Write a protein that binds this DNA or RNA. Structure first.
Ligand SMILES: [Mg+2]
Ligand SMILES: [Mg+2]
Ligand SMILES: [Mg+2]
Ligand SMILES: [Mg+2]
Ligand SMILES: [Mg+2]
Ligand SMILES: [Mg+2]
Ligand SMILES: [Mg+2]
Ligand SMILES: [Mg+2]
Ligand SMILES: [Mg+2]
Ligand SMILES: [Mg+2]
Ligand SMILES: [Mg+2]
Ligand SMILES: [Mg+2]
Ligand SMILES: [Mg+2]
Ligand SMILES: [Mg+2]
Ligand SMILES: [Mg+2]
Ligand SMILES: [Mg+2]
Ligand SMILES: [Mg+2]
Ligand SMILES: [Mg+2]
Ligand SMILES: [Mg+2]
Lengths: 46, 260, 93
RNA sequence: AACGAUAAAAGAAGUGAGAAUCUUCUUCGCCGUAAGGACAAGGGUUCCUGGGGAAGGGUCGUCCGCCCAGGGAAAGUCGGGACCUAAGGUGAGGCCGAACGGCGCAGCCGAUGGACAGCAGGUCAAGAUUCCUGCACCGAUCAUGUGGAGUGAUGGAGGGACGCAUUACGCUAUCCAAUGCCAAGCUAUGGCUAUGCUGGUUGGUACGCUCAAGGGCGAUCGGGUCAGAAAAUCUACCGGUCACAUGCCUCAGACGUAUCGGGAGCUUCCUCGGAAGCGAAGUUGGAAACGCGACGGUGCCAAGAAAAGCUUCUAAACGUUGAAACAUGAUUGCCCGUACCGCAAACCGACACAGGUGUCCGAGUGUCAAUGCACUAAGGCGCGCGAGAGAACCCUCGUUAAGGAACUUUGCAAUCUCACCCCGUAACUUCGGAAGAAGGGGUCCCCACGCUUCGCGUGGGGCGCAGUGAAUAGGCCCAGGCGACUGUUUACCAAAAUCACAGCACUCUGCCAACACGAACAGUGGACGUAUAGGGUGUGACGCCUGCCCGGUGCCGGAA
RNA sequence: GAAACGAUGACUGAAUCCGCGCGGACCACCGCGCAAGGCUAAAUACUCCCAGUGACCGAUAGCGCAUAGUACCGUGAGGG
């Protein structure tokens, strides 16, 4: 039973990363939306 | 001829001589552009490289050459002939039927109508049979590079020569284009029986998949209980038999009696 | 400058027992190089340095609350000298 | 009801408030191509020491991967960065687009791959090609001296540089034998008194005329300008000369000497347990790699990266009295990762989960071979509830009288069968196959003779109910329907008579091809393909064959 | 729709003061206006934020929160 989650550092950093949210504005949208979300923690500190 | 095999579940092969392996670009396999898959299948292969090969053969004009070896390379389906010139420059060309190893090949407008020689159509004799023809002066040869193919000469116009393309189509090709004497040898590919399933794979991926296997979602022929279908059409409902897919164009008046 | 950039001397069983091989050791400022550390330590205790090594240490305990931890994050550098030895009077700990 | 595999545990001894469970001893059973060992990913102090006993642990708990505190992780050489490039990503200029934006040459990023300087030991409670000891090696800056003159670029060239299968030779790791060598000792049970028993039996560096299979290399004069944008002494060429086998070049690895290690044990001290001191021999015979010598040899069709470092040549520039090159000291080595888990109690699965996870090493005996099978070594472990009872029922196994498919939807299930050698083997056949057809026989131990190697055959003899003596280990055949065939498919009720399939046919397409993605006279895929090509469609090896009807429907052509 | 007028996407493309646009097909009278150039607080909207009050809540209410977007769930967006 190979599970859905197969942790890869360089992956979770390539997709989802702050630098990753940089390239597009859907992700910068996500950023500011998250900042106001309460003080959440945006992806790559987690 | 061809190679054959005793009964182990087999038929044919080809026969390849003159071994070298020399000096050319890599290439990668892929089936599509920025998006999803365009041209269906052919995602397999033996990881061929590419041999940049001269077609136009202009700048070697006036300079003779000797055939070095004849190597059989993919992305071609033709014999590749190696050339060495008097310049010291080596170059690749296609290898017409019956070209021995180490004959003499010369380019230019002055050249003699012998095997492998490059020279424009205006000099090409009446009824002669040649391959590797440009549609336009310069660029390269888009005509008669394939398996066992050739094009003959049907007459002259002004700048134009009437040529016979190997669908059996008559066309007007101007005499300002270079051409290469002879038919591309290629043995005969129609011979080789391509073995069994996966002999495909050797050169390219999983072949025809019948839309009638598919489902209404997938293709038109899809759906139903049984083996059948009604209205006869492709991915998009154009249809295969006898529908001209051509458009009204420029070279269309540079074309005469296309029938078949 | 010289007197910061190295924080505090290491204290342990295998620490100051190795102080007797002429090998000293201290926690330095985590962003540092062996060169800057060389310059610093030499300009401090007035002895040339041959042997050098350095490393990077984590953190993370917690006791109370939902507070669950923090990384403190040190770095420990270790030095051997040439036959010129015995830093200051403080090699006598 | 359950306490998460039916790999069992037992006694003594210790500690403690309390012990089936924690510690020690002595036995026992279990894995041993693993259930041992080493890494990668991922986890994040889980490591070590000293504590602790709430909860967590399926019981307990003095215990732990839990709780507290302290400690522990060292690199010019290993892996990565300061080097290079693949897919991909990107991208000034540039080509598009209602916006936000889609593209795109160079360049750049990007290891999964290319390039690149050390090995051997020692040891803290916890690190080691990192620290220390012995002896290495690489680049850099500079100093004495040699030489005593050219260095020789973002540019050229060479070279990096690559497939699959199979295979001759030589060697090592490494394992095996011994009335080799060395060391320790006693051994009684009936005997052995060593010819028994147990253990150990070379690693690095250096020189050396020693031995060595294997491995790859032609050399210079010159010619044409049209070739490498230009240049050239470099490279590609056409030519002349000497080189056919001797020839050159390097030597994996062996041998000797040396030397630094290690080495069975050995001695002393012991804070009750480890420290510290010492130190023997290193033989003959056999086996042997997927490793090394090597970029070997032959064959085959589907024809098997790039780019830097690197080798040679000029352009430019400075210098041609103080160059490049050499060794000879010195000085110099920046950044990040190194603990621990890592086939699992620490990673992904809510769980201390019978699941999942890529690479490496993986011993011996018996066995044709082997990573198989059984047992075992080193190593690890008995699975964190126990103890009794021996009813129905239930699961997983063992044997069965007489019968042998009478059972049942169906021999479903479960037997029988089983390895290797010999003999022998049908219809049909695409002459390959069917075939391991079907059957029959051998198999262990001792002795003599022979033989082409482990062994094998012959003869004779012995024992048991039985001799692939235990484990691994095909039941078979006669007819058919379907598909030819290997293959593929419904992650979790359908593996098939489905899909694919080679082959065959219809048709499209003259190349900014038809065709397909697309805000788009952008771009790209077809294809760096060109009409024995490329698309779509339907049939489905092969063999014999594919008939009648176009009124209606689509399709091509025509013209009142 | 009898569809005037403003507004552009494509073709077209006049006058200039005895002139031009309008007045809901269109015509004439009769009026109203002078396009193709630009800027221009104020009165209007909103509440991250500060103050004041309330026939507003008072711990299952009141914001999700008597502080937490934390714990916790998800690869993530997100939820909480
Ligand atoms: Mg279907
Ligand atoms: Mg449809
Ligand atoms: Mg249908
Ligand atoms: Mg803690
Ligand atoms: Mg249990
Ligand atoms: Mg047990
Ligand atoms: Mg066992
Ligand atoms: Mg408990
Ligand atoms: Mg012995
Ligand atoms: Mg357990
Ligand atoms: Mg074994
Ligand atoms: Mg019975
Ligand atoms: Mg019986
Ligand atoms: Mg019956
Ligand atoms: Mg019955
Ligand atoms: Mg059965
Ligand atoms: Mg089938
Ligand atoms: Mg099934
Ligand atoms: Mg018919």
């Amino acid at each position: 039973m190979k599970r859905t989650y197969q942790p890869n550092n360089r992956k979770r950093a390539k997709t989802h990363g702050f630098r990753a949210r940089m390239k597009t504005k859907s992700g910068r949208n996500i950023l500011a939306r998250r900042r106001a979300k309460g003080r959440h923690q945006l992806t790559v500190s987690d | 001829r061809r190679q054959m095999t005793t009964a182990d579940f087999s038929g044919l092969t080809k026969k390849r001589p003159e071994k070298a392996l020399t000096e050319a670009l890599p290439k990668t396999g892929g089936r599509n552009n920025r998006g999803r898959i365009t041209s269906r299948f052919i995602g397999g292969g033996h990881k061929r490289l590419y041999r940049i090969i001269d077609f136009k053969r202009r700048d070697k004009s006036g300079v003779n050459a000797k055939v070095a070896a004849i190597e059989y390379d993919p992305n071609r389906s033709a014999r590749i002939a190696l050339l060495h010139y008097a310049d010291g420059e080596k170059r690749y060309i296609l290898a017409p039927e019956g070209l021995t190893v180490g004959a003499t090949v010369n380019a230019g407008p002055e050249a003699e109508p012998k095997l492998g020689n490059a020279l424009p159509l205006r000099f090409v004799p009446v009824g002669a049979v040649v391959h590797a023809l440009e549609l336009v002066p310069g660029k390269g040869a888009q005509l008669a590079r394939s398996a066992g193919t050739s094009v003959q000469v049907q007459g002259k116009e002004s700048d134009y020569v009437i040529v016979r393309l190997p669908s059996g189509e008559l066309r007007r090709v101007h005499s300002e284009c270079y051409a290469t004497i002879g038919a591309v040898g290629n043995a005969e590919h129609k011979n080789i029986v391509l073995g069994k399933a996966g002999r495909s794979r050797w050169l390219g991926r999983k072949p025809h998949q019948r839309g009638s296997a598919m489902n209404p979602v997938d293709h038109p022929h899809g759906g139903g209980e049984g083996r059948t279908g009604a209205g006869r059409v492709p991915v998009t409902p154009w249809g295969k038999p006898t529908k001209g897919l051509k458009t009204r164009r420029k070279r269309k008046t540079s074309d005469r009696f296309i029938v078949t | 400058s010289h007197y910061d950039i190295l924080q505090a001397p290491v204290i342990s069983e295998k620490a100051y027992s190795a102080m007797e091989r002429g090998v000293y050791s201290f926690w330095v400022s985590p962003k540092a190089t062996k060169t800057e550390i060389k310059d610093a330590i030499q300009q401090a205790f007035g002895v040339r340095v041959i042997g050098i090594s350095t490393m990077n240490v984590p953190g993370k305990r917690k006791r109370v609350g939902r507070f669950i931890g923090q990384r403190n994050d040190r770095k420990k550098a270790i030095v051997r000298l040439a036959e010129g030895q015995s830093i200051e009077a403080l090699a006598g700990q």
